[PDB]
């Protein structure tokens, strides 16, 4: 598609809040799942906005938070945690179309496909 590649191990993957919930309440090993599909070392991360949003969810749905605050995902310190998870990831990946995005938000995925060179992952 005319997109010049320069991705190198370990892949940087932003995991969104929905994916985190999902993998938690269905017992899906998110870390190993990504290393499996990317077939290489992966650094799994979550923006501060995504994990904050989880924090609210965490008030009545305990379990996502702990996994989401795990070193496996390493925090990506965005400048705008206040912005919906969706917009957060979008504004972070818009300058760094480098990072792979794992999201359950088919709306966020659609608007990321626009940007050349953004691997997209999700759970069926």
């Amino acid at each position: 598609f005319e997109h010049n590649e320069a991705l190198v191990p370990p892949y940087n993957v932003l995991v969104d809040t929905n994916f985190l919930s999902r993998t938690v309440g269905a017992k899906l090993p998110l870390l190993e799942s990504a290393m499996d599909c990317l077939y290489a070392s992966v650094n799994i991360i979550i923006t501060s906005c995504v994990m904050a949003e989880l924090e609210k969810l965490g008030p009545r749905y305990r379990v996502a938070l702990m996994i989401a605050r795990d070193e496996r995902w390493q925090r990506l310190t965005c400048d705008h945690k206040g912005t919906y998870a969706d917009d957060c990831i979008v504004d972070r990946v818009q300058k760094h179309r480098i990072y792979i995005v794992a999201t359950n938000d088919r709306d966020l995925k659609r608007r990321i496909r626009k940007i050349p060179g953004v691997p997209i992952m999700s759970v069926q």
Binding site: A6, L7, V8, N12, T77, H96, I98
Partner: protein, 227 residues
């Protein structure tokens, strides 16, 4: 030939006998060149040709550096001054008012920096290890620009450490990211991303990130403001 000012102070462009455009600076010591560079007289004022292939700053300009924080009367701490190529050009830019503190830990090379710094009251040479700012704490003052071009794997960390010693709050840091001397194995583009994050996870506000290609392979320069 024609020489004229650019958007940035004391930095000029030349129209040439043939129609080429090259950067130059106003010669602080007329009749004298530091490397092999061309000396050029126009309307009775002498300018030093600024080869982009040698000087990373000239490179960054030619790759569209928004705003250059190095100007008339600026105080710069220059980590990795080497033989004096680039630092001589920042001496020209800064003029007698401003000051450049050149830190360099390779004696073989400070040898040739000495010659540059003798001729130029602007430049204060220092044979010391940028990893220990304590060893030159007692000669330098605080500064406006932290220009950092050092071949070290932990170059970024070194830069941040010097910053919290010497960089003025709201001052600027030009940091050269040498992919191949941080790690020859990793992808240059993965390195640029992870080093910038170190600056952000301190408190530097990334202003602009330039890729120095044609001029410097596997290099990127970051401009950011310390808070």
């Amino acid at each position: 030939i024609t020489v004229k000012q650019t958007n940035m102070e004391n930095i000029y462009e030349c129209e040439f006998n043939d129609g080429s455009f090259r950067l130059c600076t106003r010669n602080l010591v007329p009749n004298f060149n530091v490397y092999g560079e061309r000396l050029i007289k126009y309307e009775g004022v002498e300018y030093r040709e600024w080869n982009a292939f040698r000087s990373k700053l000239a490179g960054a300009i030619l790759k569209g550096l928004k705003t250059n924080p190095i100007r008339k009367g600026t105080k710069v701490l220059y980590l990795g001054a080497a033989s004096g190529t680039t630092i001589s050009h920042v001496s020209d830019i800064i003029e007698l008012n401003g000051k450049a503190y050149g830190v360099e830990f390779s004696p073989r090379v400070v040898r040739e920096l000495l010659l540059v710094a003798q001729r130029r009251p602007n430049i204060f040479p220092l044979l010391a290890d940028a990893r220990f700012p304590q060893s030159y704490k007692s000669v330098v003052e605080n500064v406006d620009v932290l220009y950092v071009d050092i071949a070290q794997p932990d170059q970024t960390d070194i830069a941040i450490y010097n910053a919290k010693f010497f960089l003025k709050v709201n001052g600027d840091m030009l940091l050269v990211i040498k992919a191949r001397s941080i790690d020859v194995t990793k992808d240059p583009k993965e390195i640029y991303k992870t080093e910038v994050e170190k600056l952000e996870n301190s408190n530097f506000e990334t202003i602009q990130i330039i890729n120095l290609d044609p001029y410097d392979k596997d290099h990127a320069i970051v401009l950011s403001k310390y808070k």
